[PDB]
Amino acid sequence: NQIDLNVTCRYAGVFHVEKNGRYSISRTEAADLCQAFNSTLPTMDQMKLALSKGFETCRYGFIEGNVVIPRIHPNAICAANHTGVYILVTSNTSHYDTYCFNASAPPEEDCTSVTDLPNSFDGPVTITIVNRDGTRYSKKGEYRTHQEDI
Numbered sequence: 337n338q339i340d341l342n343v344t345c346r347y348a349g350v351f352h353v354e355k356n357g358r359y360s361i362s363r364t365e366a367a368d369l370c371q372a373f374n375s376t377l378p379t380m381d382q383m384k385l386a387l388s389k390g391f392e393t394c395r396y397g398f399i400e401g402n403v404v405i406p407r408i409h410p411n412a413i414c415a416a417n418h419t420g421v422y423i424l425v426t427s428n429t430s431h432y433d434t435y436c437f438n439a440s441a442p443p444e445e446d447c448t449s450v451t452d453l454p455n456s457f458d459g460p461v462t463i464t465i466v467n468r469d470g471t472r473y474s475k476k477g478e479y480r481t482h483q484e485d486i
């Protein structure tokens with residue numbers, strides 16, 4: 337009973353979280369997941385400031401109100417070559433990655449590793465935070481509050 341959470345650097349508190357190496361997070365699960373990181377879904381303004389500090393990914397993820405990809409460099413296979421905060425307009429499906437915002441993080445680029453999931457609750461799952469440099473932090477618990485997400 338294991339969940340891997342791959343996380344990035346933070347940029348003005350905003351970071352990306354991919355669960356189990358595939359698009360697998362619902363909107364309800366995303367809010368609960370950021371809450372376990374003492375974080376919230378970023379606002380569009382918070383995401384635009386993170387972008388300005390150096391944040392980009394090549395993966396769709398929830399923010400408050402939309403599903404987006406922050407892009408700095410145009411790449412044909414990432415958000416159809418767009419730059420800026422690219423907003424997903426048309427999709428049949430409901431599961432993506434998520435972004436999270438931690439107000440207590442540093443103001444600009446923070447590429448240190450994430451070493452804790454401070455607000456997860458008691459439960460049976462081995463939850464492993466996997467950093468881009470491969471460093472891992474694991475704990476037994478749960479973060480999903482909606483049964484349909486389990």
Ligand SMILES: C[C@@H]1CN(C(=O)c2cnsn2)[C@@H](C)CO1
Binds near residue numbers: 351441450
């Ligand atoms: C990234 C922020 C802070 N954080 C960390 O584990 C951390 C430790 N050192 S740097 N980042 C988690 C609470 C998620 O929200």
